[PDB]
Specification:
immune system, filament, Death Domain, Fas, 7 helices, mainly alpha, globular, about 80 residues, homododecamer, PYD, Apoptosis-associated speck-like protein containing a CARD (chains A, B, C, D, E, F, G, H, I, J, K, L), card
């Protein structure tokens, strides 16, 4: 939801595990060519920037799934960020 | 805590026992694929580098547990470093 | 078949023996340079992803043989996954 | 023949091994400068788009050679596509 | 079961008889090649760590068999563990 | 000849004496650094795969010589395999 | 035959006379270098493991010969185990 | 000479020992930085492609030296090649 | 200071230890994203070029620290350099 | 103290009794895992090198105790060395 | 000096004792991290390549010291090479 | 000379007394570490291989001395082999 958009800078500068997020979000909201497009990007902040460049085409449900994926992957990160 | 960040270079260049540290930190702050990635790295300083590249996503508690693990494993190392 | 696609994440995150999958599937669906490329990848989930990136060109028969290889290798893994 | 342009979308979306096609077609119809031009393109669908962008300058013989190269590389892919 | 996962560090740090464990687990869960791979590992803790690296593919039954093997082999070790 | 390629998986999974083959094939088709590289590999199936990863450069005569060495060393193995 | 791999653990754990067995199996399926290799192990279980690691290359005839050798050498073991 | 570029695809697909070629050709036609760049290439066919990417700047003498290095390294490979 | 700028070509072509320089310069003049970006660059001269690309934004003090790092790390390299 | 690293080559090349040294250093500076790791090393100089690879993590006190162990254990070595 | 650079291929392909060379060169021209990096390299020619990758930063004195170390270790090797 | 490496396989497969050879070649060609390393090898053919892997650094004189040692040790072996 709006949480990921309200903390764009922190998500860009602090996410360390993009691989699990891409695996979780594949097929339902990510098409494959986008998967190889974002995967070939060299460094983690750049991959986060590329991934969030595709958000404006998403609905509430897509952001909800992304937020759930972040909570499942790094609960401590979102817990710190919300505080 | 801030200790491991302020002494990053010394931690990279001087610590020698990494895989015990991974076992101590496994299951709470590191996941399985991250464990495999950090373990396959050949040299000890490079493994420390791979581990430290994962720090930015961590909160205060993760660094606290890491400091506890280092104190438990090499008390003499941290004792010398803090001086 | 569709089984490997609809459990893509589980195959990425849980398969531990990729070597026998390669040497069994060699000569019919993977060529030499592809085998060298997938084998040089360091970590097991990363090799799984490298192999799965080649799937979109495959037919029903290739996925059927791949599934048969999984069933022959780890019957328990596929048995747990299907449940 | 007409197979490659009548199924342009499938070739763009499903070809996974492009370097074998490139070096097979090198020298006879492909000169170097566009070889490094296409080789620097990051993801496989994009390289397929770049390669297909040069097709309007090809005659029947060149596209027949390309079809033969595809048949030699992945017989299963063309067999599925023709179906 | 979950017992071997919740006490992973202690099982790594204390188990000294890997030989009879590998003998008992051969065939039903363990094939020849990775048995050879684990048998070439120099130290006992490293052998346990390599063995545990292959657990994510296991189901409940495999973990139960491993727990039974540990109970049969070292009653004192597990008896210390639950307490 | 084609025999060693058509049963590649069986050769990977069943040959146990790589040392005599390496001694027999040294000098004429094996180079010194090649021998050092293949000898440093830990496990027998991995050594066999390292050896077969270098076969595509071989001609008919080299494969025939290797098959002759196999027949000389383990006649029973090739006899069972051909049946 | 299937007997030796059906009860591998008990054979490792109970058989006590290895020198006679190696003498019986020498020359026909065991090479001399294998003979010194297996002889160098300190304990009886280690020698038995070194021998059994060489079984995957064996055919039915070799397993039958080994079964006959064990039957002729240690009867009490075979009738006790088969029950 | 023209031999190496007329058989370019075979050289890409079948050369297995490129490291000796890099060792021999260093200092006279290969400079340090490109040697390091090609040395970091993952797979042997990719190494061959990277090395041949530098050919258009070579004269007859450099190609002759490379051909002589191929002959002295793997006589069987070339001998099969022209035939 | 001006020393590193006046010998730019020598620093690009002769520096062999990039790892310790990045470890030393981290935190004060290098950001996290800069460290990750430079760390993924394949070969040492390329990493030197990438590091020098950000120099125009540096003051006298940053170049002084960089020069001190070079002097203490490899005294022989600089000592040859000004001579 | 600083004595041990200034004569590192002679310490590697001449020390013959390692088991007693590891017994003396066990527990206070040496953990069980690294004890097993160093003890499994084949040759005495190699064991010394494995031990010395662990020095950078040590403080003055650990080196002082190791020096005392050498002095009390082998007198001829140190009495030849310091001169 | 220039001697080791002019005979680089022979040094790569013929040196058999690397560890003594590293111990001789440790401390004054080799740092700890480089020592660990070269140590993990599997094969002797490959460790020679890794060591020679660090030459460009060296001055005349460092190469002279390396030449002296080779003369001290294998006088016969350099004696044959110079001829 | 060329005699020992032209009959390398027979030397590996038939030489039975290595301790006398190491005593004869100690010091002049063999270093202390080299002697300890070759001694720790368990089996005689493996010891012969360990010794022969160190021959490429030898000149004509070392090979001549080794041939003289073999002739002095086992006249029957060389007499049979030369035929």
């Amino acid at each position: 939801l709006h949480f990921i958009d309200q903390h764009r800078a922190a998500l860009i500068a602090r996410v360390t595990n993009v691989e699990w997020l891409l695996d979780a979000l594949y097929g339902k909201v990510l098409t494959d060519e986008q998967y190889q497009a974002v995967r070939a990007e060299p460094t983690n902040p750049s991959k986060m920037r590329k991934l969030f460049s595709f958000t404006p085409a998403w609905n509430w449900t897509c952001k909800d799934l992304l937020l759930q994926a972040l909570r499942e992957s790094q609960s401590y990160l979102v817990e710190d960020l919300e505080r």
